[PDB]
Design a binder for this molecule. Structure first.
Ligand SMILES: CC(=O)NCCCC[C@H](N)C(=O)N1C[C@H](O)C[C@](C)(O)[C@@H](n2cnc3c2c(=O)n(C)c(=O)n3C)C1
Ligand SMILES: C[S@@+](CC[C@H](N)C(=O)[O-])C[C@H]1O[C@@H](n2cnc3c(N)ncnc32)[C@H](O)[C@@H]1O
Ligand SMILES: [Cl-]
Ligand SMILES: [Cl-]
Ligand SMILES: [Cl-]
Ligand SMILES: [Zn+2]
Ligand SMILES: [Zn+2]
Lengths: 301, 115
């Protein structure tokens, strides 16, 4: 019904509570495409709807906010998603992006290379990933939890996401990881969000809202991905571009959310309450320093 | 000494009939903004499209050094507003045109300081 005027559809909670088995994903509108506004790229529309959905959650938005964006390059040599992120984020927000191949970006810093070569001194308030290897949609072999960049991302979340921070990680029927789902239980809330412009694709964004650093609920990620596919399999989503035509409330409200450096001993229930409400970020507020590890070889003689 | 001239190369390429650089990243926006040339967020008005700056910069897109002595880029990290009639070639537009240092509009495409 009215879902067509939303930026997209989030996994209904009752589907998260099931214990389904993994099936093949069969979308009835598979292959259909939405009608994008004149001259608008798919990845611009997709990130816009994603951010429109994010505006409805309890994101912490501190001053001197720090956002990192993995998988930011396109096959065109540019970073459409990074540009939407910077439009959405408050001006002055520190934005770093990264991808395997070279690309031109509006981010404050860009790191080229496998994501495993990326290191940062500091913690982050928001992590976006559109990392995706299209060789995974191979429909003739079993669909097992994938490792690769997903192992990196689960580590990067545990080690470098500020408490109170949020994540959005692209997955598909075949591009998914069970520990990532399990990690979603380490946030105050989570969902899988499907953009209306790409409703014909098994793609979704796994969103963890306000990181708590510890399991709040225990999630079997094999079961949850099967739950997610079951939902997609039984809930056709009507392709829609409608929300792209209303951008008046698009920018992320700068909430001046508070930052506190704190030690594990000091995280009590008040703190955890505040983290859960989008009211608190816990991390150092030092300067932001990043690096890309480089493998050195001499191929002579 | 010898420096490549990329500005001139693209201008002659265009005059000779070559197809303009593509995949400049056009943004969704209200088209009720200030109309200023180069801004920190999309500011297109009714007669403009907004694009991500880096994707409309000739030096950025060609992996060549910027003509600023310090190599800094006017457009990267910002948003450039392009008259909808010239939005088939945002790179050519930005290269060939000039921002009024006073009002922030494109000279000849919004700047009314000289009237
Ligand atoms: N469907 C009815 C509309 C026609 C669709 C299309 N033009 C088509 O013909 N097929 C052939 C068969 O329909 C069966 C098959 C394989 O399940 C179809 N299919 C369904 N969901 C799919 C896929 C699919 O491959 N892949 C790769 C997916 O990711 N998803 C989510 C695709
Ligand atoms: C659909 S694309 C990204 C689209 C891009 N976000 C945009 O805004 O248009 C998928 C991306 O994931 C990247 N990527 C895939 N695997 C990676 C890996 N192990 N490490 C780092 N980056 C990876 C690809 O190079 C590729 O650009
Ligand atoms: Cl579960
Ligand atoms: Cl801590
Ligand atoms: Cl080019
Ligand atoms: Zn540039
Ligand atoms: Zn002027």
């Amino acid at each position: 019904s009215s879902q067509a005027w939303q930026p997209g559809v989030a996994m209904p909670n009752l589907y998260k509570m099931q214990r389904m088995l993994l099936e093949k994903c069969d979308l009835q509108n598979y292959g259909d495409s939405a009608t994008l506004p004149k001259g608008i790229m798919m990845n611009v529309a997709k990130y816009t709807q994603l951010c429109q959905y994010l505006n409805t959650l309890t994101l912490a938005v501190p001053y001197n906010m720090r956002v990192i964006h993995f998988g930011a390059g396109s096959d065109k040599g540019v970073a459409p998603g990074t540009a939407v992120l910077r439009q959405w984020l408050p001006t002055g927000t520190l934005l770093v992006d990264s991808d395997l191949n070279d690309f031109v970006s509006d981010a404050d810093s860009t790191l080229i290379g496998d994501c495993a070569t990326v290191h940062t001194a500091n913690k982050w308030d928001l992590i976006i990933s559109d990392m995706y290897d299209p060789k995974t949609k191979n429909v003739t072999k079993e669909n097992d939890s994938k490792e690769g960049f997903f192992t990196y991302i689960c580590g990067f979340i545990q080690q470098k996401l500020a408490l109170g921070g949020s994540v959005a990680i692209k997955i598909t029927e075949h591009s998914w990881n069970a520990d990532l789902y399990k990690l979603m239980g380490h946030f105050a809330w989570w969902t899988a969000f499907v953009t209306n412009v790409n409703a014909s694709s098994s793609e979704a964004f796994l969103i963890g809202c306000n990181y708590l650093g510890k399991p709040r609920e225990q999630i079997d990620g094999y079961v949850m991905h099967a739950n997610y596919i079951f939902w997609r399999n039984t809930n056709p989503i009507q392709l829609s571009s409608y929300s792209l035509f209303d951008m008046s409330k698009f920018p992320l409200k700068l909430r001046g959310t508070a930052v506190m450096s704190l030690k594990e001993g000091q995280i009590n229930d008040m703190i955890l309450s505040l983290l859960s409400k989008g009211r608190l970020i816990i991390r150092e507020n030092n300067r932001v320093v990043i690096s890309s590890d480089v493998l050195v070889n001499n191929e002579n003689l | 000494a010898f420096a490549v001239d990329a500005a001139k190369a693209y201008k002659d390429y265009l005059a000779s009939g070559g197809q303009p650089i593509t995949n400049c990243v056009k943004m969704l926006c209200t088209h009720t903004g200030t109309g200023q040339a180069i801004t920190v967020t999309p500011e297109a008005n009714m007669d403009q499209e907004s694009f991500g700056g880096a994707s409309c910069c000739l030096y950025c897109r060609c992996h060549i050094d910027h003509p600023n002595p310090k190599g800094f880029c006017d457009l990267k990290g910002k948003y450039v507003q392009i008259p909808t009639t010239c939005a088939n070639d945002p790179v050519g537009f930005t290269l060939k045109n000039t921002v009024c240092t006073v009002c922030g509009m494109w000279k000849g495409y919004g700047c009314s300081c000289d009237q």
